[PDB]
Ligand binder design. Sequence first.
Ligand SMILES: Cc1c2c(c(O)c3c(O)cccc13)C(=O)[C@]1(O)C(=O)C(C(N)=O)=C(O)[C@@H](N(C)C)[C@@H]1C2
Ligand SMILES: Cc1c2c(c(O)c3c(O)cccc13)C(=O)[C@]1(O)C(=O)C(C(N)=O)=C(O)[C@@H](N(C)C)[C@@H]1C2
Ligand SMILES: [Cl-]
Ligand SMILES: [Cl-]
Ligand SMILES: [Cl-]
Ligand SMILES: [Cl-]
Ligand SMILES: [Cl-]
Ligand SMILES: [Cl-]
Ligand SMILES: [Cl-]
Ligand SMILES: [Cl-]
Ligand SMILES: [Cl-]
Ligand SMILES: [Cl-]
Ligand SMILES: [Cl-]
Ligand SMILES: [Mg+2]
Ligand SMILES: [Mg+2]
Lengths: 195, 203
Amino acid sequence: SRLNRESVIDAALELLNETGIDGLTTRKLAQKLGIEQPTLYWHVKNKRALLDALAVEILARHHDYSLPAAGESWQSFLRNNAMSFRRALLRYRDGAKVHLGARPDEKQYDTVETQLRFMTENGFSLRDGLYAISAVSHFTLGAVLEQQEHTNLPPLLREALQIMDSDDGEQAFLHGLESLIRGFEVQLTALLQIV
Amino acid sequence: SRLNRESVIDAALELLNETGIDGLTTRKLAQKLGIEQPTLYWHVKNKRALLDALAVEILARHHDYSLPAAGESWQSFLRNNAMSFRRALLRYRDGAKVHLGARPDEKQYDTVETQLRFMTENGFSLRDGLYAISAVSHFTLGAVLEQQEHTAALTDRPANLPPLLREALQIMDSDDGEQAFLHGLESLIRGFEVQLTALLQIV
Ligand SMILES: Cc1c2c(c(O)c3c(O)cccc13)C(=O)[C@]1(O)C(=O)C(C(N)=O)=C(O)[C@@H](N(C)C)[C@@H]1C2
Ligand SMILES: Cc1c2c(c(O)c3c(O)cccc13)C(=O)[C@]1(O)C(=O)C(C(N)=O)=C(O)[C@@H](N(C)C)[C@@H]1C2
Ligand SMILES: [Cl-]
Ligand SMILES: [Cl-]
Ligand SMILES: [Cl-]
Ligand SMILES: [Cl-]
Ligand SMILES: [Cl-]
Ligand SMILES: [Cl-]
Ligand SMILES: [Cl-]
Ligand SMILES: [Cl-]
Ligand SMILES: [Cl-]
Ligand SMILES: [Cl-]
Ligand SMILES: [Cl-]
Ligand SMILES: [Mg+2]
Ligand SMILES: [Mg+2]
């Protein structure tokens, strides 16, 4: 079939959903595309290059709250950004593991720069804005990964696992997300006061 | 060599450090131990069973702050517990990935039950106590996984930059992620406290 970048990514994402990250291979990608491996090699040099690209394209296609709305608070931005990031990570099997494989791509520079600058324009030092942003990202990746890799008992644990199965993990995520945001606000608002 | 449980695990952890999780195999374990594959199979059925066991043993051996001290605040417990969990996950190559491959095994049940009961004995409902312990777990595992997968990716290929990102990467690379971790940990804890203290008040 067609092997422009867009069609290769389409096929890879389809395969990802079928196999998972570990079972995804360039050999199986070649098969899905109806092509010989050396043909695929001209387009995709190895699994790592493939995964680097998927990490970028999954956000490009499906993470629609990368940027704050005009006039939006930093609190509401981190919240909306985290929900959107989570949704994008959940969209494909082992999506969180696909993301972890890499740091911001050149295609993502402008976006992540704007995110960092936005936090600084709302009172954070670059360092404290970064720590906020990284905490949200790491909490969210953790919440998603635990979901994805889960794809006699004592009483509380029993009922915990009962609770922690009630939904897909969204409840514990949203609650933790609020705790995180409020903790950041307490820090920022204290200035030089002992807090 | 010796193939009691403790010895198989010792050799597997040693191998994990050598190869990382993707590169660890039962074939390579057999070689390390000086035995044939069907011999190893009697002891260890497959890679998954092996990893299950590693995930448990890594915590058993190296996660020293599983339980609160007598009289300890819930805040201080979560702090000390997270620091310990992080250290244990960082101790072996791809440790967080090894951990993620499972939920509490029987041998852990009682530790985690004691953790949940302790939160409830300090004013949390089971639900809110669990959300707290979970958020700590998720934040910590995410932070370690990013650090470890970043290490792995670098040995496959090298890593222009806008100024804040540059500065942010220089800041992130200045240690192993510990500063960012400890700062985010305090934010999370204080957020839990604010929520707990509110009771039924709008907050
Ligand atoms: C600022 C930053 C970010 C990310 C990141 O990995 C990163 C890093 O690895 C080193 C230094 C800085 C950053 C994100 O992954 C990302 O997920 C992302 O790419 C991203 C994006 N592309 O829109 C985000 O939404 C951000 N958000 C989850 C807080 C976060 C931003
Ligand atoms: C409560 C709980 C925990 C964990 C966990 O995986 C889990 C789950 O998968 C479902 C429901 C509840 C839990 C932990 O992994 C663990 O890391 C853990 O086993 C653990 C331990 N065994 O000591 C911890 O220290 C805990 N801490 C990091 C918050 C956390 C506790
Ligand atoms: Cl083509
Ligand atoms: Cl294209
Ligand atoms: Cl595309
Ligand atoms: Cl491959
Ligand atoms: Cl707003
Ligand atoms: Cl939606
Ligand atoms: Cl023996
Ligand atoms: Cl033994
Ligand atoms: Cl042992
Ligand atoms: Cl194997
Ligand atoms: Cl204390
Ligand atoms: Mg990232
Ligand atoms: Mg766990």
